[PDB]
Amino acid sequence: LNIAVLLGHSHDVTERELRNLWGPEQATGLPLDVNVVALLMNRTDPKSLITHVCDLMSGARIHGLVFGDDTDQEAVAQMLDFISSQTFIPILGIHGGASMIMADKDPTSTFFQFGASIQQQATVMLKIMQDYDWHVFSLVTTIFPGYRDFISFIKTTVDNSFVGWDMQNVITLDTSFEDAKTQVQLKKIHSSVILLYCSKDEAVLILSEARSLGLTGYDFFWIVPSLVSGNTELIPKEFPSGLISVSYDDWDYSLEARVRDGLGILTTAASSMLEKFSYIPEAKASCYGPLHTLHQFMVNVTWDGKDLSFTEEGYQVHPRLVVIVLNKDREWEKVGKWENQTLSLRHAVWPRYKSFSDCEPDDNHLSIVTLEEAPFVIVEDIDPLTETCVRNTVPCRKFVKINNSTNEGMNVKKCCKGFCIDILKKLSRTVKFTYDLYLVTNGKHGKKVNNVWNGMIGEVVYQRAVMAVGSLTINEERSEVVDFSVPFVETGISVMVSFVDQVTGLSDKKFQRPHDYSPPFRFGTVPNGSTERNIRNNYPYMHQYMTRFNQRGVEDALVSLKTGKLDAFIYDAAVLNYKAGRDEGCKLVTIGSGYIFATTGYGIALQKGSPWKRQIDLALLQFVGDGEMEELETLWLTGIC
């Protein structure tokens, strides 16, 4: 219909592409009289706004108005809201302060914007917090209005969440701070994620006070709304490099596609309203000196597949959200995009931003790799009902390749429980550090293939990680390459067979030749294992007999022992004890209790010269010397008979 698009910009968007923004648009023309008028104004005073509105409304009864702005003056949107209330004309905002988010519109005004609200932005930010399991947080609110609705929305969202959020009490500011009574509430902050809701002027003072407090640490996150994030050019020096912000400022979609979608929505509403009633276009004659409108009609609208439907308050249903961070180059780094319902993440691995400034010494970020072991590291899927690991599990990632022709893969994130997970959680409780837990992709524990290691040994020795919380056997060259901690559990080796006992130990007469006994029996180990190295250092002839007796999997060897495809097996003691304590039937019987066996322990391998080694050696003796290790053994072992 009669639609005028006026644009106030300094960014040189010319007029002729707007005249070319009418031809292929509305290919199936249901309104017969469609006329668009493109205008460009450089001055942004409300005098010219009222003047051009009174010129275009008298200009052959223009019914549609579309406006964008380049500056950051939010009063222009309020002026256009008053103009739409007086003139009864649906006006759309596109860019800048004419499209900023305000508190409460009126039913007397037919002005509409795009994008999300502060409640939908809070929902997106809590979705960010949910996807990263940052459940321990706080909330700091200033005297900027609309704050009690913000606090109540956070409370109702926590009350309507599958998380069970750990929310600290709301730190409410009163005036410009004396730094006497507000500092008492700031020293109560012991959480990690700090939620701040303020304006741009007070944010500098709040971040400077938090930097003076030392509350701008590596674990002390900062997530800010869109309105405090002002000019992209004007960036004060008090921002932490890694400042999380969420705003609808999208550079991939320019103003022309947005005004084309707005024209599509307006013509769709006009064409669907023309079938309901005929005399829909009725405007005011002149400024000097309606029953059926589109104010209550275009709640349902969808153009070109993109669901751009509206709400009953003046917002959209499915907007496009932008998640930006601050790099080390003091620039707003655009990272995250939002889907129609869920959230997309460009960086699935969250970056640390360990140094927000140059004078920030940090020593607590530790990279940990581990291996899947059934009594120790249980790796399972994420819960599809919550998209959240249960509290007693930790997140993990693994670089799993897609196909075998290329080497590209995906870091699939899963959940982890078990025994070493409990050890790592108690170390995080006591030592109070940060961990970076993930899975190994090369293979097993480690094997020197011609002065080349692999697996967790290749991750620790080449210093891509720090330590391994998971279980590891200890021999000579492993103690040569790294430094082990103190052991905590008495786990030697053992032999599983089918009370009578045939094998007495390593001094068995069966360990000489199976031709000596009338049934030719069989026993092997797991491939690529350190037990193989222990046998090859003990007896090479035993390795020569075991070469024809190899197998593949621990559960495969278990099925081979149950059915009868294997006679005996050599493994460690306590893992076989745990597998036999939960087995139905209990036909497989262990041999001894570690008498003619290796009788080694399980330690934590650290790098040569790590400062954490003494603290871990104190913490393990603290965990064993109070029965808490016995509590974990009661939790993760079942001693039957």
Binding site: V486, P487, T599, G601, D617, L618
Partner: peptide
């Protein structure tokens, strides 16, 4: 004692028990 001196690797591995007479 780990806070005051340094420790080596343990050579013995055992637990505790109760001496009674029968």
């Amino acid at each position: 004692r780990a806070q005051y001196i340094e420790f080596s690797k343990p050579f013995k591995y055992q637990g505790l028990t109760i001496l009674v007479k029968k």
